[PDB]
Write a protein that binds this DNA or RNA. Structure first.
Ligand code: LFX
Ligand code: LFX
Ligand code: MG
Ligand code: MG
Ligand code: MG
Ligand code: MG
Lengths: 245, 487, 487, 247
DNA sequence: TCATGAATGACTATGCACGT
DNA sequence: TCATGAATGACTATGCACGT
């Protein structure tokens, strides 16, 4: 059991449950999204840590400089665990660490930066499956008479639209389908019913299979060697669509 | 170099600041209950078409449009004002429909301009109803490029409904919000008893407006402060939140606060109790837990000790926290460019006067426009009766000026009417189309008679305000939220 | 809960970021030399009518319109982008006409959004010239509400003219600006020698584009780096400021710096000299005084000691300060959605290709519209020849549809043409107006002939680009600023 | 008497001049970072220094002294002027013999003027008595003639006058671009500020004079003091006749 | 001493590549 | 380490009147 704040980051909106096994930390991109997330959460089990700006690349940055970064300190402090050799999973303050970023490319980038921090400083969190990725909605279908539906892809949008029209439901061609361009555009209710409500949220658990392969990929993508990264992108971007076929 | 005395400079400059702040910044106009920034934002949104019949526009566009045409100030504070008009815990009847993170009753700030969208609410659409029919005076904006409204039609009593708070110079205002349905009853009575004096009018209106109606619900304790405000323009209204005592399986009791008085910050409230228990000022309290959520609303659980009486702890909370707090009513508003502290009968009366003005001016505009159409229609009818000649005349004319000048002489017609004949399409020369012109003339002449009748009878004018307002209230009126109890 | 491997996640996410930054953020499109934000700002301003034929609009309105319709990002960074496009020391040929405080070449920041106004420049109007004539592909915006241009007409070679600098992922670009008149000569040659191979074209274009032309004037020392850039797509161009030695009666001699190389901050430059003298790494310097003003421009006076040689101190400045500094050219641009390092002949050719595409598409659009206009006019002429019948027919019709259907039968007409006759005003039945319709048909048929000729002859197409560009250069072309000298 | 100017122990916001002679030096106290920015660019750096003030200045009449001395903007003014305050005032250490207050023509500029004048009169009165305090009058309009040099107007009357004269003289204006209206110093660029408020050969300055000190003391206390009622009644009494003070 | 709310924006930190 | 330039906003302090 562990004490919650009511010696931790000022930005942290901690949970009420003192059991890490039952607790969850939502690491959120942006104060806006973090603000509404703090409101839509279940304050019993869910804590919110809003991150401001692009996270520092720990692969490139010197160790001392990383430790001066306020955002990194907030993450390390809030997780409670140490880093590197002083890592102690026993002091993990949340057994669920959900990264929640925009569906846009900068959200993807921030994800890579956070995953890099975790893999290099706090790897056991990934190995033991404490790291998750929240999948935000892309569309909100606003039916004239029926309850609104959320879609997490262009395909799901087309499907739910097709099904609803077939079922006799109707939509305005003005209000119509709201498209989310980021978590910041959502209110508290919307975030709950799409990314935080445990009965409907779409989480992806980050798994670590080959550590040596991961170590190599992290160094290529996130390291200081541009040429290696440049050639890797030109080599593999051509086939990024077909990774799951 | 010119010399100037410090006394002249100080007096002139400070008076200029004080007066503009008083009349043109901090205090509401009595007729629509709006400050300049509010009015300019709403009109900017309105003119831009950011209306409920279309999807929310990015809020930056509303701010920018307000900045560029009407309000020569900063984007930041203009956004703050727009945001406020969209918060259901700030305005009893929101004028802005916000989409996104607009903050909370606590210390959670609203999202930045970039993240939010916004449009006018249906009630705000009634603020601006028929503003384009010369129902209000317009003046040039800050650089004379465009016109802006001096006041809005305000087809519902917005000042009393949404209230107003403002710090000016030498004075300040603090008008609480009220229940629209109760205000309507007051207006309805004022319309029926249009000859009643101030003494009678105040008695009638005070019977119908039972007291302020806050967006945050809660309680009003006592009736003196409310009565004071309505009779004096000043009064102290005691507010309370709602507390419900809950018992536990162990037998422990806890206090659950689900409502707080108007303009009490939820987070400051919790922090205040927490700070008043650590220093030793609210003993009997065992634990403070905020079980609030977006789904259950406000829910502050105060577990009390076994050797503690619930009402004793509740009374202590009333004493030492804003669980009980007073609203300092000061009914100050601008009347005809002058700040004035007003009785409730005056606030209603002045609003009713504004409505009658709007209806008469609207009728005047519609009457003028009807006559213009009729005038042109008469010209067209003259052309149809002598259509063979009219066409032959235009054809045989070398120019259009020759054709026009000829038409005046041919049919004894104005130049405006003759111009209408020239602008006439071959479409309208069809049999049924010729007939519509005739019928339209008949139609309009009936409309003109109706309009003339309205202007001649103050009774109908009042009837229109009543019926139109009644329609608005039936559609957008809601239940009372703040419960009124006795001592 | 679905499982995902970290390698899969990292690779997909980072590649997606890298590719979007590369293609859709940091690097310029080769055809118009613009990044997405530039293109969207300019088009937003254009569509809003913020043009040189009207007064400057508040810059917030440009930001908001860009933000709300095309560019789904923050107001702050969009304003920064708009501001830069208005600074004469940043862009060799500014695309934004700024009104107010837009900062300085030093550390003086631009005024906030609220204080500044902005509109498109005449040259930016050439970027957008005839964009509404289907000269470029449009796509739906970020929410499908409206259309935006994928590229601008760019009726002057903007990429080479204004240059471009951008940091992407795995790569970066650094294209210097160039003198418009020199670029035009290269384009003119490319048009004349349209069949010339790459070797000849590169030689020709390199002869006409003598080197970069920076808005900050200054000097280019040597020719190797310039040659490298045009031949390789990469090259190091050594820049220098301008120094003028002045002597004082009795007093000592002083160095007066009136120009600095491209992208050297005036204040950082002065500070660098000052800090390298205090510690003592630039002996011979006695005093540093910034005599700059809005009226004399840059003027940094460096008084040197009496036992010091001016040329020695100047070389020391070249070595240890940015009085001499290199421009690291890397001619990287997006070509058909792919990043590519380009020779100067490729940059010109690709631009010329874009211009020809624009002219052909414009001609096609105008030909289609001309045919539509002619088609309807033919209908009108048929009506005039049988004018007596046209009127009589319409009269006897119960509807307009019966009148329409008859016209088809009467004159052998389309549904579109008959509708046009129906929509015709009696105005046009006057003699001169009937003649105007005839002559208008004749004019369009002549225009159609011209248009058809253009599409059939590549010679004319090239001729149009030449003549139109030449007109632009004659009007908006200016003298070279950066002086090119030998070693 | 000469004193050192900062060049790479004075306020960071201060853009000091080069001349070490206070008698020839001038301090422009400017409303807003934008206006101060353009002033720093359009000034004559030899004799003119710029101190931009950010936000409304603290009312020294209402606030206690300890709180006033903690206000960063007040500290900047006191430090830049070089003189002490109250009893420790020493005019000999005055770093600028011309202290020009330059605020917007709008009402908030007037307000800031009263706050600054209150600071000066209460903390550094001799600066007013000896005529070291001036008020810059910003332009309100810029007439942009099609062919002729643009003219600036400091009132609605002058606008109408210069407009009439120019048209009578055969000059012409666009009805679009036309007459630019300034709503604040921040809307002006460097050149405009120089040619209207900083160029000593064309600038319109007003020198603050102090006749009756006792009367001034009273007026300052009424308008700026803690007593609201006194201020309220004074405004209602005298606002009616503010137009006719110079008739 | 704190809240109100309509007025008067610079500073703070990262990603990314490349050259000093 | 620093500049470049588009990308990812909260915090900071006064005026002003009034009531706890
Ligand atoms: C991402 C948001 C919030 O974080 C930001 C900054 N912080 C990053 C880390 N913080 C510890 C302190 C500073 C910052 F210095 C600048 C900006 C900024 O310029 C900006 C914009 O739209 O222009 C938007 N943001 C910024
Ligand atoms: C007047 C400008 C510049 O000065 C400002 C502040 N300073 C006050 C005193 N300074 C020591 C440091 C901070 C401030 F705290 C807030 C704002 C602000 O919110 C704002 C706006 O448009 O909303 C505009 N400004 C502000
Ligand atoms: Mg985003
Ligand atoms: Mg603010
Ligand atoms: Mg920024
Ligand atoms: Mg101002």
């Amino acid at each position: 059991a562990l004490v919650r704040r009511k010696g931790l980051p000022g930005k942290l909106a901690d949970c009420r449950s003192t059991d890490p096994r039952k607790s969850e930390l939502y690491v959120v991109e942006g104060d806006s999204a973090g603000g509404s997330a703090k409101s839509g959460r279940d304050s019993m089990f869910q804590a919110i840590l809003p991150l401001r700006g692009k996270i520092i690349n720990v692969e490139k940055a010197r160790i001392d400089r990383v430790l001066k970064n306020t955002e990194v300190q907030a993450i390390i402090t809030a997780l409670g665990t140490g880093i590197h050799d002083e890592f102690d999973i026993g002091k993990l303050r949340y057994h669920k660490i959900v990264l929640m970023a925009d569906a846009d490319v900068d959200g993807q980038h921030i994800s890579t930066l956070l995953l890099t921090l975790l893999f290099r400083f706090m790897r056991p969190l990934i190995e033991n499956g404490h790291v998750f990725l929240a999948q935000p909605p892309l569309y909100k279908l606003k039916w004239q008479r029926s309850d609104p539906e959320f879609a997490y892809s262009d395909r799901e949008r087309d499907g739910l639209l097709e099904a609803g029209l077939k079922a006799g439901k109707k939509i305005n061609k003005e209000d119509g389908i709201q498209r989310y361009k980021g978590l910041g555009e959502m209110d508290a209710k919307e975030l709950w019913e799409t990314t935080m409500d445990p009965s409907v949220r779409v989480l992806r658990q980050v798994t670590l299979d080959d550590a040596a392969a991961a170590d190599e990929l992290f160094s290529i993508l996130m390291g200081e060697d541009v040429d290696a990264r440049r050639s890797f992108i030109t080599r593999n971007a051509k086939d990024v669509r077909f990774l799951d076929v | 170099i010119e010399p100037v005395d410090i006394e002249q400079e100080m007096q002139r400059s400070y008076i200029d600041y004080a007066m503009s702040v008083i009349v043109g910044r901090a205090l509401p106009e009595v007729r629509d209950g709006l400050k300049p920034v509010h009015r300019r934002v709403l009109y900017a949104m309105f003119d831009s078409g950011f209306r409920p019949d279309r999807s929310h526009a990015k809020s930056a566009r509303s701010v920018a449009e307000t900045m560029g045409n009407y309000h020569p100030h900063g984007d930041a504070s203009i956004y703050d004002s727009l945001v406020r008009m969209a918060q259901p815990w700030s305005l009893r009847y929101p004028l802005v429909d916000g989409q996104g993170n607009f903050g909370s009753p606590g210390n959670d700030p609203p999202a930045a301009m970039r993240y939010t969208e916004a449009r006018l609410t249906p009630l705000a659409m009634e603020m601006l109803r028929e503003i384009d029919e010369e129902t209000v005076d317009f003046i040039p904006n800050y650089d004379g490029r465009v016109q802006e409204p001096t006041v809005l039609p305000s087809r519902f009593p917005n000042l009393l409904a949404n209230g107003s708070g403002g710090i000016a110079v030498g004075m300040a205002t603090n008008i609480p919000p009220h229940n629209l349905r109760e205000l309507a009853d007051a207006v309805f009575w004022a319309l029926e008893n249009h000859d009643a004096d101030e003494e009678e009018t105040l008695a009638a209106v005070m019977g119908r407006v039972k007291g302020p109606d806050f967006p945050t619900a809660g309680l009003i304790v006592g009736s003196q402060g409310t009565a004071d405000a309505y009779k004096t323009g000043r009064g102290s209204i005691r507010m309370r939140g709602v507390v419900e005592v809950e018992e536990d399986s162990r037998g422990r009791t806890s206090l659950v606060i689900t409502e707080l008085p108007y303009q009490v910050n939820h987070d400051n409230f919790i922090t205040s109790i927490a700070e008043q228990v650590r220093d030793g000022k609210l003993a009997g309290i065992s634990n403070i837990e905020d079980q609030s959520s977006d789904r259950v609303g406000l829910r502050i659980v105060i577990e009390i000790k076994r050797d503690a009486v619930a009402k004793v702890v509740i009374n202590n909370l009333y004493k030492h926290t804003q669980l009980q707090t007073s609203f300092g009513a000061n009914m100050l508003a601008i009347v005809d460019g002058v700040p004035r502290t007003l009785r409730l009968d005056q606030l209603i009366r002045y609003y009713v006067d504004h409505q009658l003005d709007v209806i008469v001016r609207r009728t005047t505009y519609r009457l003028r426009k009807a006559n213009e159409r009729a005038h042109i229609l008469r010209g067209l009818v003259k052309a149809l009766d002598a259509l063979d000649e009219v066409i032959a005349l235009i054809r045989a004319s070398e120019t259009v000026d020759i054709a026009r000048a000829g038409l005046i002489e041919l049919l004894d017609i104005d130049e405006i009417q003759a111009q209408a004949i020239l602008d006439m399409q071959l479409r309208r020369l069809a049999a049924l189309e010729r007939q519509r012109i005739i019928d339209d003339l008949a139609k309009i002449e009936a409309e003109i008679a109706d309009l003339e009748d309205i202007l001649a009878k103050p009774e109908r004018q009042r009837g229109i305000v009543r019926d139109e307002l009644a329609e608005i209230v039936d559609r957008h009126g809601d239940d009372r939220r703040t419960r009124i109890i006795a001592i």
